[PDB]
Amino acid sequence: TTLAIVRLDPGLPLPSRAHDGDAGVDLYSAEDVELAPGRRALVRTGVAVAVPFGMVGLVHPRSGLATRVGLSIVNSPGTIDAGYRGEIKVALINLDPAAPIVVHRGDRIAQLLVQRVELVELVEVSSFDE
Amino acid sequence: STTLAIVRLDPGLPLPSRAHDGDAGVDLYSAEDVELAPGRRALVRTGVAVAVPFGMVGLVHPRSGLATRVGLSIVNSPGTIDAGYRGEIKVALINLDPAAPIVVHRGDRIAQLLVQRVELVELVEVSSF
Amino acid sequence: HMSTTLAIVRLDPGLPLPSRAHDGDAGVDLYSAEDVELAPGRRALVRTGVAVAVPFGMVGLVHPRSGLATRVGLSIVNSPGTIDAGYRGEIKVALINLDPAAPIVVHRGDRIAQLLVQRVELVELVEVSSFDEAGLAR
Ligand SMILES: O=c1ccn([C@H]2C[C@H](O)[C@@H](COP(=O)(O)OP(=O)(O)OP(=O)(O)O)O2)c(=O)[nH]1
Ligand SMILES: O=c1ccn([C@H]2C[C@H](O)[C@@H](COP(=O)(O)OP(=O)(O)OP(=O)(O)O)O2)c(=O)[nH]1
Numbered sequence: 001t002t003l004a005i006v007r008l009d010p011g012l013p014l015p016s017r018a019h020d021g022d023a024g025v026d027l028y029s030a031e032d033v034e035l036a037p038g039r040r041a042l043v044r045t046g047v048a049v050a051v052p053f054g055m056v057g058l059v060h061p062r063s064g065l066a067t068r069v070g071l072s073i074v075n076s077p078g079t080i081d082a083g084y085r086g087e088i089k090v091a092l093i094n095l096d097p098a099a100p101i102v103v104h105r106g107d108r109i110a111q112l113l114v115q116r117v118e119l120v121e122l123v124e125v126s127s128f129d130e
Numbered sequence: 131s132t133t134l135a136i137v138r139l140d141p142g143l144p145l146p147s148r149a150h151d152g153d154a155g156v157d158l159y160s161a162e163d164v165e166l167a168p169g170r171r172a173l174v175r176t177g178v179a180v181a182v183p184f185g186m187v188g189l190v191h192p193r194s195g196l197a198t199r200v201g202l203s204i205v206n207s208p209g210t211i212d213a214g215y216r217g218e219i220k221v222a223l224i225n226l227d228p229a230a231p232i233v234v235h236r237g238d239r240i241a242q243l244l245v246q247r248v249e250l251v252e253l254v255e256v257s258s259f
Numbered sequence: 260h261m262s263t264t265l266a267i268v269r270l271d272p273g274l275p276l277p278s279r280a281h282d283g284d285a286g287v288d289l290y291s292a293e294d295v296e297l298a299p300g301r302r303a304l305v306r307t308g309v310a311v312a313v314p315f316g317m318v319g320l321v322h323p324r325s326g327l328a329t330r331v332g333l334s335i336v337n338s339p340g341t342i343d344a345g346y347r348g349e350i351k352v353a354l355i356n357l358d359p360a361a362p363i364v365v366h367r368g369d370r371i372a373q374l375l376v377q378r379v380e381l382v383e384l385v386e387v388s389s390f391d392e393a394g395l396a397r
């Protein structure tokens with residue numbers, strides 16, 4: 001499958017899959033931001049994508065940063081719908097009780113996966129079969 | 131074209147729906163009013179039960195707007211709905227804001243439900259990699 | 260459906276092999292290899308005593324256990340944890356106590372997470388100057 005991607009911010013590298021078989025491509029921060037303990041920010045990644053119909057984009061936290069500094073994503077896994085053509089934004093939060101997180105423009109702050117989704121049709125029933 | 135059987139345990143709420151074609155999830159409603167003080171959690175009823183087909187999994191995800199705007203999260207995200215489960219879907223909401231309480235009223239949309247295939251892998255112990 | 264195998268190594272042989280508790284359950288439970296106490300707001304990187312070989316074309320996903328999320332506010336900082344197809348190391352779980360007041364005590368042999376395996380689309384990114392110009396312009 002291909003994923004069309006617009007670099008809204010041309011100063012950042014194109015997201016790339018570091019190893020073959022890696023699930024995600026890393027997303028970059030377009031901005032310098034400091035998160036005090038317990039505080040959050042909505043951070044621009046400088047990209048937009050066109051997730052194919054029948055698929056979903058998923059924004060996951062990076063594991064390294066998660067343990068080392070307690071960086072997380074409030075709405076994790078972030079859900080990118082097929083019809084979304086805006087900028088991908090990452091709702092970062094510092095879950096460390098005492099130390100700030102310094103995020104720089106150019107840092108890898110999340111990863112983007114693409115998977116198939118079942119666009120189920122909901123059928124209301126009165127009860128389930130037992 | 132897969133169908134997802136659903137029961138409104140709470141008949142007074144709208145049926146969950148896909149806002150646009152292609153959207154991965156359907157929004158779940160709260161059946162209840164809840165106030166979450168900063169850092170507190172609550173297990174909130176949605177008024178629905180579903181029948182995830184065998185070979186698939188139900189996934190409860192946070193909504194992006196409330197996440198940023200008020201710091202609303204889900205403790206066990208992504209909430210895993212197994213194919214054998216036929217009880218009420220409940221959402222473990224938590225307030226990750228430091229100072230501002232979160233108000234949820236009955237009828238608010240508090241989460242989204244995705245359905246995916248899952249690989250029901252058979253584990254095989256090996257000596258080494 | 261009929262799936263494949265997942266090769267698994269018990270780096271810690273005193274723990275039980277993860278298993279699927281019921282036939283169509285999405286996940287298998289992972290165990291803690293360690294005793295650890297998490298004070299309110301504190302996290303730890305907890306060893307599970309296992310390594311896996313997620314098939315190429317797939318991803319392993321580490322999800323929190325719902326039960327403990329509710330009873331005690333246990334969560335996973337990088338949820339869902341992403342286990343890449345090429346990883347052969349030990350699976351570790353970034354546990355965090357989201358309760359404001361009660362410590363969480365984790366014992367060796369306790370179930371601390373679940374592991375799912377799914378297909379993933381190993382997309383090839385194609386840069387386009389704009390969606391409008393690409394014919395892709397909710
Ligand atoms: O909950 C997890 C998540 C990941 N991992 C392992 C598997 C994976 O392939 C690797 C890296 O994960 P990720 O890409 O999320 O973190 P990173 O900070 O980007 O580290 P790396 O440079 O190793 O990718 O670490 C775990 O043991 N447990
Ligand atoms: O981490 C994320 C998650 C979402 N989005 C964008 C993509 C997506 O299609 C849209 C809506 O996300 P979601 O459906 O989670 O939020 P909502 O509060 O339910 O908004 P909506 O009313 O637009 O569905 O916002 C992001 O940029 N980053």
Ligand SMILES: O=c1ccn([C@H]2C[C@H](O)[C@@H](COP(=O)(O)OP(=O)(O)OP(=O)(O)O)O2)c(=O)[nH]1
Nearest residue numbers: 190209210211212215218219220323324325326
């Ligand atoms: O956000 C969620 C997550 C799970 N469940 C339901 C679905 C699922 O199949 C069941 C899990 O029950 P169980 O008591 O087996 O949980 P556990 O064994 O403590 O952990 P897990 O749910 O992670 O298997 O509860 C929900 O209603 N909402």
